[PDB]
């Protein structure tokens, strides 16, 4: 059984613990401890290969990106610093990695609220310039959860 | 002030019940873990419990383990069945971000 080392990277209040935690428990947990980390392992059925996740859900190192295979960077919606950081990981990422091909998916998170202050297209276009998959999600009705993971996990794949 | 109990020796497919007493009320913490290092290994998360209820297990104690939090008692539980020498290391308990135990030791033989 193959294992994937999955890092969940971005700013502060994105919704990176809350993904994790719809992913490994199937519930929305609201206001999760902002300065918890952890890792969590979950075996998974992924394009019918049985597989396990081993995921960094980080909290805000150079260590635990030297680890990651693959890297889910995470902005949210309404919040168009956190989106603006986005390319401050991938640099970091692409740094300490000492590659061209760190597998990576652009995932902009809270899509169920109206206030959307960072549309699709800027997104898209951002992820395009990378080549990487974007993927949007809402932790708090799983919409896109599985996607985001899975998505990340076929990039590893590739690679 | 967390007083820690119930580590020790035991033989492989024993049991251990450990536990985690806080001397201030728990009500207001929302989360729980119990962690663990074993000689040679990184610290691991073994397992959380969760608002609503749910709970974590790690894939290596996963039908083993059972966590569970007496709010009452201010006290966090840590059930062990079906003990195997891989399950030895020093276990910890944290309720929340920053209350840690100061440890307890789980030797496992065979």
């Known amino acids: 059984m193959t294992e994937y080392k999955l890092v969940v990277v971005g700013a502060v209040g994105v919704g990176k613990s809350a993904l994790t935690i719809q992913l490994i428990q199937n519930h929305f947990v609201d206001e999760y401890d902002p300065t918890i980390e952890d890792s969590y392992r979950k075996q998974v059925v992924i394009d019918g290969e049985t597989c396990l996740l081993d995921i960094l859900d980080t909290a805000g190192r150079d260590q635990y990106m030297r680890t990651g295979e693959g890297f889910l960077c995470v902005f949210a919606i309404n919040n168009t610093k956190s989106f603006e950081d986005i390319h401050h990981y991938r640099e970091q990422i692409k740094r300490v990695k000492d590659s061209e091909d760190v597998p990576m998916v652009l995932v902009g998170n809270k899509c169920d609220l109206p206030s959307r202050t960072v549309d699709t297209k800027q997104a898209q276009d951002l992820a395009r310039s990378y080549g990487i998959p974007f993927i949007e999600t809402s932790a708090k009705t799983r919409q896109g959860v599985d996607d985001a993971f899975y998505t990340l996990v076929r990039e590893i794949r590739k690679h | 002030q967390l007083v820690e109990s119930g580590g020790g020796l035991v033989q492989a497919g024993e049991s251990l019940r450990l536990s985690c007493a806080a001397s201030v009320s728990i009500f207001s913490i929302n989360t729980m873990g119990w962690y663990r290092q074993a000689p040679g290994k990184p610290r691991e998360l073994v397992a959380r419990?969760?608002?609503?209820?749910?709970?974590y297990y790690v894939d290596s104690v996963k039908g083993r383990f059972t966590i569970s939090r007496d709010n009452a008692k201010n006290t966090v539980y840590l059930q062990m069945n079906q003990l195997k020498p891989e399950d030895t290391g020093v276990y910890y308990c944290?309720?929340?971000?920053?209350?840690w135990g100061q440890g307890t030791q789980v030797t496992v033989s065979s």
């Open positions: 944290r309720l929340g971000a920053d209350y």
């Open positions: 419990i969760f608002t609503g209820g749910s709970t």
